[PDB]
Amino acid sequence: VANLVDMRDVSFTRGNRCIFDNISLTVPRGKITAIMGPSGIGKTTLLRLIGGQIAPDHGEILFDGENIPAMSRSRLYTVRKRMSMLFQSGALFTDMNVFDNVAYPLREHTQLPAPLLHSTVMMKLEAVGLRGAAKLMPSELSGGMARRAALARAIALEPDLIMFDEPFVGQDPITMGVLVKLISELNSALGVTCVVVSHDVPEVLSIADHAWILADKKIVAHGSAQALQANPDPRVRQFLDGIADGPVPFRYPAGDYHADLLPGS
Amino acid sequence: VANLVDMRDVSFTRGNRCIFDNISLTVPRGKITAIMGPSGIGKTTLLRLIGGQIAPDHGEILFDGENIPAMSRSRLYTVRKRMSMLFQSGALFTDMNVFDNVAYPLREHTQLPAPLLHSTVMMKLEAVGLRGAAKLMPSELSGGMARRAALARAIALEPDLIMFDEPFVGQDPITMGVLVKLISELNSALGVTCVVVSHDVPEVLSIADHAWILADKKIVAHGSAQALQANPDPRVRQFLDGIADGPVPFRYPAGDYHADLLPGS
Amino acid sequence: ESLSWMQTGDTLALSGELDQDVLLPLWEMREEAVKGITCIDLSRVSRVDTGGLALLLHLIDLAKKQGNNVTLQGVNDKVYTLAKLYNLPADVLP
Amino acid sequence: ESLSWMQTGDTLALSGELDQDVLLPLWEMREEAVKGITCIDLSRVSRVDTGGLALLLHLIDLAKKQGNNVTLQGVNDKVYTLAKLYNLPADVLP
Amino acid sequence: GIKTLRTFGRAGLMLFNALVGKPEFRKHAPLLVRQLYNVGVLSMLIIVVSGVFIGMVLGLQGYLVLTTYSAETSLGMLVALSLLRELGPVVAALLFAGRAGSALTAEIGLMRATEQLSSMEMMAVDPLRRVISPRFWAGVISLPLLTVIFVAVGIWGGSLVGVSWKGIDSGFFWSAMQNAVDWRMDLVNCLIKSVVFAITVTWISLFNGYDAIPTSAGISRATTRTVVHSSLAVLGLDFVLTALMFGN
Amino acid sequence: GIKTLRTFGRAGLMLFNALVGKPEFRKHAPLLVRQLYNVGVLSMLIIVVSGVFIGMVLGLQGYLVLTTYSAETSLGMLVALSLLRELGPVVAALLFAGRAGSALTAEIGLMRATEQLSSMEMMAVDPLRRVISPRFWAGVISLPLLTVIFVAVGIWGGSLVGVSWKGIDSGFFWSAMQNAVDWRMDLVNCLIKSVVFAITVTWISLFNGYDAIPTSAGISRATTRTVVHSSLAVLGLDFVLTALMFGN
């Protein structure tokens, strides 16, 4: 199969505010794709969707063949062994320190011997970079090292599809670059196919091999970073550089601006 | 006086982790300066410092002449009438809706007539842009409109020194641009002299007229955005583009990496 | 710190700081202030602040309230500066 | 899904998947596995995963434990790929 | 060290600047109204309904006590006087420490974390005199009122027990003996306890929200610190109070 | 509508998948130990100290009751039997609902907001069977134990009142009459109530932390919803329980 996951035509409603509509996406294996759009448009919802943790209203999301929804809710766990979200804010377990906070999926799945697992975790930590931070608690690390250790623990099981929920968000350019180098070197080293859903364009497009762009209720553009950078499309041209005013309104809708100053004009 | 606020030589200790050390800064009137550094290095502390809400250990911070510390703790309020922090996360009052959430400093200070104050607030809202969002509650707006309405209420009293605590942080480039245009058009329209403490360089340097850059315990560089962009300095060259590895370590300190894998090597 | 205004027949000559503070003593009798006013010249107005703009806007509303095309003479650069900033439409400021 | 290893005198010929799962049946008798081993050739090793790297590292430690310069023959591109990725020093992998 | 003297000095300080100052009245009265509504009026059901059951229990449970001594007339004298001397100002103090003794620190601690407080402090309006004080005076004038509502509804529930469930005493229950129960000194002694408990609860219910390390795991642990101290000190001061109020 | 049936259906569902499943034991025992320590062992002082005062009060206050009827020997029979039938399983239920009935939803709600729960759910390990259940079984086996500790220390405090403060009864207090008080059926009836209160508290103390709108103002309002329901339903089920346990 050419792609790793095909979201054929998903419309997700989320009650009364229909989030997605007949959206179409195709993450290919080996390619570190990305999807970007307005902030809080619900793309994290799209991620948590590809994880089965929420079901689509009417659509076929096919991870590596079979459908995510058509799963045994334990067969779902079997296949989800081949995924790992990298949520922002770390999502480290506050109780166990990083070392154990990394080992968790191992001890959960592998039958690994104790001194073997210790070294594998002490190795993934150096991989991501915060090896010396094994003993430290998650409530003690920074906001960047938190995401980094979360990444390290996320690569365990070599998930072959590790999606990033806006990792470089609220991050200085040094940590931003550490992140954009880590998740690049990974795909360029492992066979991992990261799906970075984010909205920091000058950072994402640096490594994104095939990006998608979604307006409020659908995807509007995709392609390569270069073939996207040169897109002549208002909704797209706006987001791609923040012209701050276009088809997305800069001014919130209001009435006439005149009596607003002159009640009983 | 040439500058608006002179932080001559501040060393702030914050107990056992000395945040600042003999730092030197000079915000000039009319110039929308900025200060940038590592995330969580405590620059927001520097802001809350220029607001008197915390005192320096050993230093002379002079807002427009007199010292911030040498103040009557009510004379401090008199002068603080000439300031307004624009904190991230909005800091709108959760109770009163935006309209009232904007009017608050007015009703607190001016003797403004009710229909006069109504129009002045309905005018500042259009200024920032979210005029139609007068009736809406702060817990209802987005994370961007929150900062925007907070800005609108912050410009009331025309504070002549309105410092921004990392406003475009965790913000898509469209809202990022709306923000970077608002706080630019303001200084280019009012006599406001914003002090943007932030760490989103490709955004801040777009409008920053005189930036400062601080390493962990002091400021290392300043100047103009262009004269800073071309700085050959490791600690600076690192942050300015996120080379992800330099005088700031990418790898956390650890021991020998060898027995770490081989307990009892 | 000061504000002084005179109806000079057709011209409403106000002069001063025009901020939220010095504004009240004018805001009340706005009616007789715009009694038979044809235009307002904000000539000897040292500076101007947002509240001043608001009150001036109300004054224009009154100038049109009895029904009369008002104009603003001697206006300042800073006033129209804010007028762009506050995005005030040119049907209420002129 | 499979793993099979033979001490061929000087060469430790293991073959298979070398992941966290198929790894245990080798990890125990590692001592006799590296009894008189001079080098290990990971030739018929289809793929390799992190746990496999860890165990191999321990095996190298043992190869040096009695005291012997070991080498790795038939190694894979992916192995040294990870070895760069995991930043493993070339004194423990060779 | 910290809690030894620094924490308590800070807790006293943050109050000594929270009430005494400019006597501004017509500014806080609108705020005081809404703090009363949130803290006191909204929490009504937390002590109305919960007043019923703790009454009816003391009824039904107390019923099967003096019924063993066959003195069923003294019911109100044993029911009311009980929940009017001890159970009122303590059970409606713990229910309070829940609905408004916690929600406050989880409302004003939230401010210090979402930085509404520092932003207020940035305008010349002081955050203490303008946010702590309206809440403080909503508390120390709602809690004793809450206790009265609580005791009234508890007596009504005890009635429904000793009257409706058991048609045993109609006026012989209350209209006969509670005359010898409803005296002034009793309500005085109950209201003193209620006032002291308001003071204590809505003091530490508001020192945490001001001393909370501002993070989503700071305000949540601080809410716990409030519902801990606002029962530890509640019961402690109840013991000391009833000692000095009846051990004469 | 929502709370009408959807919220309660969801609250039942989130439990019906929280215990029954794979019988995995040697995996949760280490987690169960630490949940017991946090919820039960750490909260010891919340019911040790608070057990003292509510005892001593019932002592000193109860003292000046039968002293009016000059039956000072029945003190334990009126003290212990009281805090062993009603005051134990309710006061140490509210102190619990504070220290661990709140801190839990403000600990597991925090997870759902910091996304530890969804990340767990992302590994094949289910979050319910692995995070809800160790806490649930820490609660429903600590609370009844907490109540026993509470009643014991309360009796000790009542002693210090009726013995140390008033050297009136040494064995005539307890060693004489509490023989007619310490019978089995009483502890049975108290432990049934304690178990039902554990069930209820640490159920809604854990349905909010799972049904909490994940934001720093969601978990704080949810902690309040816990300390509200975990006293409303606590007292309600206490009333119904004591009704069906003594109205025979």
Contact state of B144 with A251 under an 8 Å Cβ cutoff: no
- Point out the residue among B53, B81, B89 whose CB comes nearest to the CB of E124: B81
Are A12 and A217 spatial neighbours (Cβ–Cβ below 8 Å)?
no
- Can you tell me the distance from the alpha carbon of E166 to that of E73, in angstroms, rounded to the nearest whole number? 12
* Closest residue by Cα to residue E66 from E52, E54, E82: E82
* Closest residue by Cα to residue F86 from C18, E60, B85: E60
The partner residues of C13 in beta bridges, in order of sequence, read C6, C41
Structure tokens at A252: 């919130």
Contact state of B127 with C86 under an 8 Å Cβ cutoff: yes
SS3 content of chain E, % helix, strand, coil (to 5): 80, 0, 20
- Cβ within 8 Å of B, C 17-46: 20-21, 23-24, 27
| R_g of chain C computed on alpha carbons | 12
D chain contacts of residue B257, beta-carbon cutoff 8 Å: 87, 89
B chain contacts of residue D57, beta-carbon cutoff 8 Å: 261-262
- Can you tell me the distance from the alpha carbon of F187 to that of F182, in angstroms, rounded to the nearest whole number? 8
Contact state of C54 with B156 under an 8 Å Cβ cutoff: no
Neighbours of chain B (3+ CB pairs under 8 A): A, C, D, E
In a domain, D93, yes or no: no
- Which CATH number covers residue B118? 3.40.50.300
Q: In whole angstroms, how far apart are CA A204 and each of A42, E99, F61?
A: 18, 46, 71
Instruction: Please tell me what resolution, in angstroms, this structure has.
Output: 3.9
The answer to whether residue F106 neighbours chain E at the CB level (below 8 Å) is yes
In a domain, C91, yes or no: no
The answer to whether residue A257 neighbours chain C at the CB level (below 8 Å) is yes
- Can you tell me the distance from the alpha carbon of F216 to that of F230, in angstroms, rounded to the nearest whole number? 21
Go through E216-236 and write b for each residue having 16 or more CB atoms within 10 A of its CB, e for each that does not. bbbbbbbbbbbbbbbbbbbbb
Structural element, H or E, at residue F86: none
C chain contacts of residue A261, beta-carbon cutoff 8 Å: 54, 57, 92
* Closest residue by Cα to residue B201 from B218, B221, B185: B221
F chain contacts of residue E235, beta-carbon cutoff 8 Å: 50, 53-54, 57
Contact state of F102 with E216 under an 8 Å Cβ cutoff: no
Contact state of D85 with A186 under an 8 Å Cβ cutoff: yes
How many separate domains does chain A show?
1
DSSP per-residue codes, chain A: --EEEEEEEEB---TTS----SEEEEEETT--EEEE-STTSSHHHHHHHHTTSS--SB--EEESSSBSSSS-SSHHHHHHTT---EETT----SSS-HHHHHHHHHHHH----HHHHHHHHHHHHHHHS-GGGSSS-TTTS-HHHHHHHHHHHHHTT--S--EEESSSSS--HHHHHHHHHHHHHHHTTSS---EEE---HHHHTTT-SSEEEEETTEEEEEE-HHHHHT---HHHHHHHHT-SSSSS-SSPP-S-SSTTTSTT-
How was this one solved? cryo-EM
Residue B23, class by beta-carbon neighbours within 10 Å (0-12 exposed, 13-18 middle, 19+ buried)? buried
Contact state of E115 with B77 under an 8 Å Cβ cutoff: no
Nearest chain F Cα distance for residue E21, angstroms: 31
- Can you tell me the distance from the alpha carbon of C92 to that of F31, in angstroms, rounded to the nearest whole number? 69
The answer to whether residue B119 neighbours chain C at the CB level (below 8 Å) is yes
**What is the domain partition of chain F in residue ranges?**
26-246
Domain that holds residue D7: 3-86
How many separate domains does chain C show?
1
The answer to whether residue A115 neighbours chain D at the CB level (below 8 Å) is yes
Nearest chain C Cα distance for residue B92, angstroms: 21
Nearest chain D Cα distance for residue A126, angstroms: 6
Neighbours of chain D (3+ CB pairs under 8 A): A, B
A chain contacts of residue D55, beta-carbon cutoff 8 Å: 116
* Closest residue by Cα to residue A129 from A146, A143, A107, A112: A146
Q: Do chains D and B touch (3 or more CB pairs under 8 A)?
A: yes
- Cβ within 8 Å of F, A 136-175: 150
In a domain, D92, yes or no: no
Number of A–F residue contacts, CB under 8 Å = 49
The answer to whether residue B81 neighbours chain E at the CB level (below 8 Å) is yes
Contact state of C50 with B156 under an 8 Å Cβ cutoff: yes
> Which amino acid belongs to residue D62?
L
Q: Give the number of C-alpha atoms closer than 13 A to the C-alpha of residue D17, restricted to the C-beta side.
A: 9
- Can you tell me the distance from the alpha carbon of A197 to that of A212, in angstroms, rounded to the nearest whole number? 9
Nearest chain F Cα distance for residue E243, angstroms: 7
A chain contacts of residue B177, beta-carbon cutoff 8 Å: 241-244
- Can you tell me the distance from the alpha carbon of E80 to that of E84, in angstroms, rounded to the nearest whole number? 6
> SS3 for chain B, per residue?
CCEEEEEEEEECCCCCCCCCCCEEEEEECCCCEEEECCCCCCHHHHHHHHCCCCCCCECCEEECCCECCCCCCCHHHHHHCCCCCEECCCCCCCCCCHHHHHHHHHHHHCCCCHHHHHHHHHHHHHHHCCHHHCCCCCCCCCHHHHHHHHHHHHHCCCCCCCEEECCCCCCCHHHHHHHHHHHHHHHCCCCCCCEEECCCHHHHCCCCCCEEEEECCEEEEEECHHHHHCCCCHHHHHHHHCCCCCCCCCCCCCCCCCCCCCCCC
Contact state of B119 with C54 under an 8 Å Cβ cutoff: yes
F chain contacts of residue A109, beta-carbon cutoff 8 Å: 123-124
Which residue of D49, D50, D55, D56 is the best one to mutate when testing the A interface, meaning the one whose CB has the most A CBs within 10 A?
D50
Contact state of A108 with F124 under an 8 Å Cβ cutoff: yes
- Point out the residue among B109, B124, B185 whose CB comes nearest to the CB of C50: B124
Nearest chain A Cα distance for residue F113, angstroms: 9
Contact state of B260 with A122 under an 8 Å Cβ cutoff: yes
- Point out the residue among A131, A174, A252 whose CB comes nearest to the CB of B38: A174
Q: In whole angstroms, how far apart are CA A239 and each of A170, A199, B89?
A: 18, 9, 22
Collapsed DSSP state (helix, strand, coil) of residue F68: coil
Residue E184, class by beta-carbon neighbours within 10 Å (0-12 exposed, 13-18 middle, 19+ buried)? exposed
Domain that holds residue B230: 3-261
Contact state of F223 with E223 under an 8 Å Cβ cutoff: yes
**How far from each other are the two terminal CA atoms of chain D, in whole angstroms?**
27
* Closest residue by Cα to residue F92 from F27, F157, F48: F48
E chain contacts of residue B108, beta-carbon cutoff 8 Å: 123-125
Neighbours of chain F (3+ CB pairs under 8 A): A, E
Contact state of B112 with C81 under an 8 Å Cβ cutoff: no
* Closest residue by Cα to residue B95 from B129, B138, B65: B138
Nearest chain D Cα distance for residue A54, angstroms: 30
- Can you tell me the distance from the alpha carbon of E224 to that of F102, in angstroms, rounded to the nearest whole number? 7
Contact state of F232 with E49 under an 8 Å Cβ cutoff: yes
Contact state of B87 with E118 under an 8 Å Cβ cutoff: yes
A125: nearest CA in chain D? D86
Structure tokens at B206: 């777009």
Contact state of D50 with A158 under an 8 Å Cβ cutoff: yes
E chain contacts of residue B146, beta-carbon cutoff 8 Å: none
